[PDB]
Symmetry: D4
Subunit: 205 residues, 8 copies
C-alpha cells in the first residue's frame, strides 16, 4: 500500500476531487484542551492514503482545511464525535457534512454490542486489521513504518463500510434517522468542546 507522508499540509488537492473522503486523526490523548493533534489521515477510497504530520502549535493547514470546509464532499469518520472536536479545536473549522460508521453500526448491527472498527471490518469485509498493542508517541519527529501503516489502516476501509451501511440503512428503513443523527453530530462535538463532554444533554438525569 502506497502511503504518502507529509508535514503540515497536503501539497494540493489533486488527489481529492471526489465526493467523499475518509478522515481520521491521532492525538496525544482524549482531551482536546490538553492533548494536541499529531497526525491527520485521508483517503480517496482507493488503495492509497495520505498521512499528514501536524507540528506543535500549528494553527493553519489551508489545503486540508479547504477540504474539510467543502460542503460537496462528505467526510467519513469512525466515531467522528472525537475527530470533529479535535479538528475544530485545532484549525477552527467544524465540518458539517459527515458520515459516522459507529452511529451507522449502532443503527443497523442491532444483533451485537461490539461496534469498534476492528469488529466491523472483520464482519462486513472479512478484512483483518491488526491493531498495535503497545501505544506510542505520535508526536515523535519521525514516525516509524509500523506507525505509518497502522495510521493508514484506519482510513483505507471507510468507503466500503459506508457503502455497506447505506445498503443496510435502506433495507431496514432508517435512512432519515441516520441523516438526522449525522446532521446533529457536529453540534454534539461542539458541545464537547464547550464543556459538556461528560453529559448526555438529552437524558432525564
Amino acid at each position: 500500500t502506497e502511503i504518502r507522508v507529509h508535514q503540515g499540509d497536503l501539497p494540493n488537492l489533486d488527489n481529492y476531487r471526489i465526493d467523499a473522503v475518509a478522515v481520521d486523526t491521532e492525538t496525544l490523548g482524549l482531551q482536546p484542551h490538553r492533548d494536541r493533534l499529531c497526525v491527520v489521515q485521508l483517503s480517496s477510497g482507493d488503495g492509497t492514503a495520505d498521512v499528514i504530520q501536524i507540528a506543535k502549535g500549528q494553527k493553519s493547514a489551508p489545503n486540508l482545511v479547504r477540504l474539510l470546509s467543502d460542503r460537496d464532499i462528505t467526510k467519513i469518520f469512525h466515531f467522528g464525535r472525537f475527530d470533529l472536536a479535535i479538528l475544530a479545536h485545532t484549525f477552527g473549522v467544524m465540518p458539517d457534512v459527515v458520515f459516522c460508521t459507529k452511529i451507522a453500526s449502532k443503527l443497523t448491527r442491532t444483533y451485537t454490542d461490539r461496534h469498534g472498527l476492528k469488529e466491523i471490518c472483520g464482519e462486513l469485509l472479512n478484512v483483518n486489521i491488526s491493531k498495535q498493542q503497545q501505544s506510542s508517541d505520535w508526536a515523535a519527529e519521525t514516525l516509524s513504518r509500523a506507525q505509518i501503516e497502522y495510521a493508514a489502516s484506519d482510513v483505507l476501509y471507510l468507503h466500503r463500510l459506508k457503502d455497506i451501511f447505506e445498503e443496510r440503512l435502506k433495507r431496514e428503513e432508517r435512512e432519515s434517522v441516520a441523516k438526522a443523527c449525522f446532521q446533529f453530530l457536529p453540534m454534539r462535538a461542539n458541545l464537547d468542546l464547550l464543556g459538556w463532554s461528560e453529559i448526555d444533554i438529552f437524558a432525564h438525569s
Copy 2:
C-alpha cells in the same frame, strides 16, 4: 385559575391563535407502547389552561393535532423527549418546532444538578408549585379537582420560563447550541419510539 376540561379534543382553536403554546401530557406510565395517553394540557400563557381528557383507544383529535402540526407555533415542553414520543405514538404526528425547558436549564443553569420543573419554577419565578405525593389513576372517567389543578399547574408557567431561558441563552451566547438541540429533539423522541430508548446514540460505549 380557570381550567376548562374537555373530552377528546378542543371544541375549536379560538383561544390558540398565538405564537407559542405550552404542552404537557399525563399517561399511565413511562413506556409508550404499554401505557396509554390519558390527559393533554395546553396553555396560551395567560392565567388559564385547557385540560383534555383522552379516551382509551382514541386515534384522532383533529383540532389538537392541527395545533401540534402548525409550524408557526412553538410547542413548549418540560422534558419534551417524553411528551413528543407519546403524542406521536398516539396521534401519529410528530411536532417539529419545539422548545424544552429542561435542555435550556442544562445549558444555562450550570451551577446546579437539579433541573426538575419544581426547582426551576422556584428559582426563576419564586412560584411554589406543590406536587402531589400520592400518584393516581389518570385514566379515571372523572378526574378530581385536585388532579385537574395539578395537571394545569404543569403548563401555567412554561411561557415565563421560556422568556427567561431565552434571556439566559443570549447572555451566555448559547443560542445556536440550543437551537440545534431543539431541532434534533423530535428525532431523539422518534428514536425512543423505534427501540433505542435506553441508548445514548452518540456515546462511545
Copy 3:
C-alpha cells in the same frame, strides 16, 4: 375494631363460611428455616379480624389448616410469596387458590414504583395505616394492644383492595395474566422453600 385473639387455632369456622379470606402472618424473620411463625391473622372482610398466636414447635392447627386447604375459598395476601412459604413450612399445607395484591399492583399501578401496602391503601382507599417504627418480639407470650392492632390492620383492607384491583385488571385487559401469575405463585413459594429463594428461575442470568 373488634379483634379476637386466640392461642393455637380458631375455635371453629363459624365466622369463615365465605368465598374469600384475608390472610397475613408474622414471624421472627425472613428465613423460614430459621425464623418460626408467631402470629396468623384472618379477616372475613368485615370490620373484625382474628389474631391467632402460634406456639413454638406447634405442628397442627386443624381449623386454620382446613380453611387454608378449602379450594372454594380464595386466600388474599399482600406479597403472598412469603406467607405461603412460611405457612407450608409450618403446617405442611400449601394453599393453591390465592390472590396477591402486590402482583396485582405491579400489573395495574404501572405509574409508580412503590407497591407496598401502605402506599396502596393510601392511594386506593384514602385510608391511613400507621406502621409501627420500632420492631418487636412477636414471640412474646402476651402481645401488647398496639401489636394486636397493628397485626389486625394488615388484613382489614385486603378485600376492598381485591375488588378494586379486579376492576383495574378488567379495565386494562390483564385478567388472564394475573390469573396465570396467581396460579404459579404457590410453586414460586415452594421453590423458595426448596433452596432457590435468591434465584429468578426464569432469568437469562
Copy 4:
C-alpha cells in the same frame, strides 16, 4: 449432516409426525418489537435438521404454525422465554406445551453457575459445539454454509438433553417443580411481549 433449507414454511409435516420437536430461532436482535424473526430451525431428533428462512413482513407459515399449535407435540427449546416471545409476536400463536433445557439445567445442575448450551452439551454429551465468534446478518437473502451449519447445531442435540434432564429431574425428585415452571413459561414470554421484559414479576422489589 443433512440440513434442508426452506423459504417461508415447511412444504409439509411428513417428517414431523413425532412426539417432540426441537425448536430454535434467529433474529436481528433481542427486542421483538424492533428486531424481526429471520430463521426458524426444527429437528425430529434424528441426525437431520430443517432450516426455514423467514421473509421480511411474513405473517403466516401454516405448516410451521400448525406444528407449533399441536398440543400433542412438546416443543423443546433452550431458553424458550425468548423464542416463545418472538414466535408469538411474529405468527400470533403461543405454544403451550414446552420444555426448556435452561430451566432444567438450573433445576438440576446446581453445582455450576454456567447454564449456556455449549457448556451443557459439553458436560452431558461430550459433544463440542463450536459457536461462531463473529456475528452475522441473518436477514441476508442467501445464508452461507457456515451460517446454515451453525443454525442447525442449535437444534441437533435438544432431544438427547431432554432425555438426560428428565432422568436428573426424576432422580432429584423435582419433576413437579419443572412441570409447573414449564407450564408458566409461555405466560412469562407473553409478559415480556406486553412490556414487563425487564421486571421479575414475583420479586419483592
Copy 5:
C-alpha cells in the same frame, strides 16, 4: 444521675466488687494506631457511672487495668470489637471474659437489620437515649457537662440489656453459639490490631 469524673484512673475499686461491669470508650477516631484513647466509662449497673479522662501518652491505669484483667468479672460492651482493640493497644491488657450486646442482638433480634445501641435500647427498654449530633473533641482538657452525660449514657443500660439478651438466647437455644462468639471476640480484636482489620478471616474471598 451521679457521674463521677476522674483523671487517669479510678481512686480504688470499692464500687466495683461486682460480677459484671459495663465498659465503653471514647477516642479521637476509628484507627487505634493513629487515634488515642481519651475517655473510659464504667458502670456497676446502678444509676451511677464513672467517667475516667485518659491523658495523652498515658501508659498505665493500675486500678482500671486490674478490673479489666479480673477473670471473675464479665466486661459488657456494645461492639466490643473496637473497645477491646483500643484498650489492649493503650494499656497492653486484653480482657478475656466479655459480653457484647451487638453480637447478642445479631443472634436474637433476627427480625431487623438495625443493631445500633439506640434502637436496641428503644425496643428492649423503651428508654430514649439522645445521641448528640455534632461531634466533639474528646481530648479537651475539660469535658463539658453535655459530653459527660452523653458518655455516661453509653454504659448506664448495658446490664439490663445483658439480662434481656440472656433471656432471649436461652429462649431461642443459642447460648452455646453466643458463648463461642464471645470467647473468640478478643482474638478478633487482636487480629484488628495486627493488621487484618479490613479482612473477614473466615470468608471464602
Copy 6:
C-alpha cells in the same frame, strides 16, 4: 454586619494592611474553563467583609491581584483547591502562601467524615451559618441582599477557624504535615487547570 459591595476591584488596600486575609469566590459552576468568576469575597477577620462583583470578560483587578500576590499575607480558604484554580484562570496570578481549613479539618477532626464549612463552624465556634437552599444566578447585574449576606458569611469566620486549627495541629504534632500540604496546594490547583482535575496524581491506579 457591614458588607461593602464593589464592582471590579477594591478602591484601595487601606483595610488590608494585615497578616492574613480570608478569601472565597462564587462562580457559574465547577468548571473554570466554562464557568466564569462572578464574585470575590474578602475579610480582614473583623466583623466586616468586602464583596467584589466581577464583570464578564474582566481580565484585571490590580488592587485585588496585588493582595493575592503579596507573599507576606496568608490567604485563608475553605477548599482552596477550587478558588486557587478559578483565581489563577481569571487573573493569571496563583497565590503561593495559603491556608485551607478543609485540609486542616481532615488532618485534625479525625473523628468525623463531615468536613464542610457548616459543620466545622457549628462544632468549633457554635455559630450557625444558614446556607441558602435554592441556587442562584451569581452573574446577575444586581445581587440581592440575601445573596450579599450569604456571600459574606463564607469569609466572616475563616480567621477564627485558622486559629483553632493551628492550635489543634500543634496539639497533635501535625504542623509540618499541614505546612507541606499547604505548600503543595497551589500546584494541585494548577494541575486541575492543566487537565488532571479528575486524577489523583499520587494514586497507584
Copy 7:
C-alpha cells in the same frame, strides 16, 4: 497413585492410626440443606488416598464418623468452613480438632490475594494440580477414573502444606492467632448451618 474407592464407609481404620488425616468432600452444590454429600476423600499423608462414595439418604458411616470424632487426630482441610458444615449436616458429628490451609494462607501468605489450593500447591511445593474445567455429576453411581483422580488430588498434599504453614506461622509469630481461629472454625460452620451463612457475625454492619 493408588486410590481405593469405597461405598458408604471405610472397611476399618487400619490405615488411619495416625496423628492427622487430610479430609475433603464433594457435593451437589454449595447449599448443605439442598445439595447432598456425594464423596468423602481421606489421606494418611502418604502417596495413597481413600475415596468413599456416599449413598443418597445415607445417615451413618460408623468408621468414618469414628475417625471424625477422634480428638487425638487433627483433621486437615482446605476451606474447612464448608466441609465441616456438610459433614455435620450429613452425619450429625462436628469435628472439633481441625487445621485449615486457607486460614493459614491468609495468615502467612500476606503478599498475595490468591489463596486457592492450586496457587498454594504451586508456590509452596512446585506441584501442578490440574483442576478439571467441566463440572460433573458427583452423584453418578459409577465415578469415572478422571473423577477419582481429581477427587484424590485434593487430599494428597494437605500434610505437606500443613508442615510448611506451621513453619511459617512459627517464623512470623502467629501461632496463637491461628490456634484461636482453628478453635473457632467449627462454630463458624455451625453458624452457617443455623442460618447465618451470608453474615459476618463480627462485622460492624
Copy 8:
C-alpha cells in the same frame, strides 16, 4: 548480568559515587506496619545491580542509609510512594531528593491508562521484562537465582527511563509540575505512615 547479593548492608559506597541511584524494595506485603522489608535493590545505571538481603528486626544499614540521606544523589523509584514509606518505617530516614517514573508516566504518557513498569519499559525501550507469575517468600534465608534476577530487573532500567521522561517533560513543558510533585512525594509517603494511606488528602470528598 552481574548481580551482587549482600546481607544487611553494602560493604562500602565505592560503586555509588554517582549523581543518581535506582532504588526498589521487596517486602512481605503492602502494609508497612505488618509486612517487613526483606530486600533492597540498587543500581548505578550500568549493567550491574546490588541486591541487599535485610534481616528480620534489622534497624540499621549505615552505608545504605548514608546513600539514602545524601542530598546530592537523586533516588529513582517506580511508584516511590511505597518504597519511601517502607524505607522510612524500617530505617528511620526519609529520602528527600527523588524521581518517580510512575508520576512522570502519568504526566507524559497521557495516551494510555497503563502505567506499570512492564508497559513503560516495553514502550520506551523495547525491552521485555518478564515478571514472575507465582509469588514468593522474599523472607527466605537463601533467595533463588530466579528471585535474584527478578529483583535486579526492577532497577536495571530506571536511569534510561528517567532520561527519556525528562526529555518528554521538557517537550511538553511540564518540568515544574513534575518537580513540585516529586518535592511533595516524601510527605505523601509520610502521610501513608501516619494513617492516611487510604485517603486522598486533596479530594473534595
